[PDB]
Amino acid sequence: MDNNYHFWGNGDRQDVSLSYEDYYSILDCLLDEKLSPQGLMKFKNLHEVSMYGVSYVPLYCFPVAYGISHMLTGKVRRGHSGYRNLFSLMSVVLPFTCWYAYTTPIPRRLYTEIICSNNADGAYVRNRIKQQKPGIWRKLSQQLYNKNFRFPELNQDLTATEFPLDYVAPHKF
Amino acid sequence: VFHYTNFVQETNAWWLRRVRPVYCTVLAYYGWWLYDRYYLFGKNATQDIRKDTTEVWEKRA
């Protein structure tokens, strides 16, 4: 528990977790004219954080890919002599590690604020993700229901008078 | 020998130790003067206005 829990870019263990790919996909189906200035500021701060985060992700993945490439080459560490094979084979191993990292969702205070806000901006973003990005919204709604968030857009809504628009995954009642 | 230095010491050591400091310090003071003039305009103006008396300032106006 660091000493910067106030920081917007920071996150908590139980905060809403969203992948970088999911965030970039969500950016596609949103319009700035339909967001309040506060929501626009939230999105701008989120982009400010993501600008550094996306670039740093390969930095985080580098050691794992380097170790995997060494293991693939063998049990011999030949230093400069093996750089050609190490970085030719690592040129495909590191993309796999970055793929896994990007598919891995990470919690963020900005993510939870933008998604779970109980205002017009929150409703708008949730509805846009539900309509234009059903695949992402299914997982997002499952996560929200598991984390005890109740909204009319959630497919797991037990007090709704209209049938869900997507498959409801198994969960504990 | 270990002390062989790849530097042309013919008048270069004397220049760098005697002529360089003088004009380099002159340039440093000139740059500081420019920096202060540009950035501390308000303080300098206030000090100048407070140096002289009200009557002389009225006469100048």
Binding site: E21, S25, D28, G135, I136, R138, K139 | -
Partner: protein, 122 residues
């Protein structure tokens, strides 16, 4: 005019058939798009049978090939039919790929024509 992203669902056979029939026989589509779809169909129909015929010939040869001929019938037929299966599946796959690629290009043209993309304008 459809969901985009890795979590989305890839085009189904029924959806592709419906979309191509819509492009062929709909009134809102343009003559150029209809011609594109028709040309796709006619120019793709060939590979489906070309691959099958090539596979048949190659399998007929491989049945009498030096080792397949002396192999027992249980091994002989199975080994000799492999080239036919490979060529047939290749022909069908290439036919479907060409037809679907050109139909998808026609669908993109239709979407641009009717302004149904949220990030495309003149």
């Amino acid at each position: 005019m459809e969901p985009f992203g890795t979590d989305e669902r890839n085009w189904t056979h029924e959806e592709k058939d419906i979309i191509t029939r819509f492009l062929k026989y709909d009134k809102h589509v343009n003559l150029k798009t209809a011609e594109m779809v028709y040309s796709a169909e006619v120019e793709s129909a060939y590979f489906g049978k070309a691959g099958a015929l090539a596979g048949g010939v190659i399998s007929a040869l491989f049945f009498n090939f030096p080792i397949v001929r002396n192999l027992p019938i249980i091994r002989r037929s199975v080994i000799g039919v492999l080239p036919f299966l490979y060529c047939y599946t290749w022909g069908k796959n290439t036919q479907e790929e060409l037809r679907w690629l050109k139909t998808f290009a026609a669908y993109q043209r239709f979407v641009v024509y009717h302004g149904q993309h949220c990030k495309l304008w003149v």
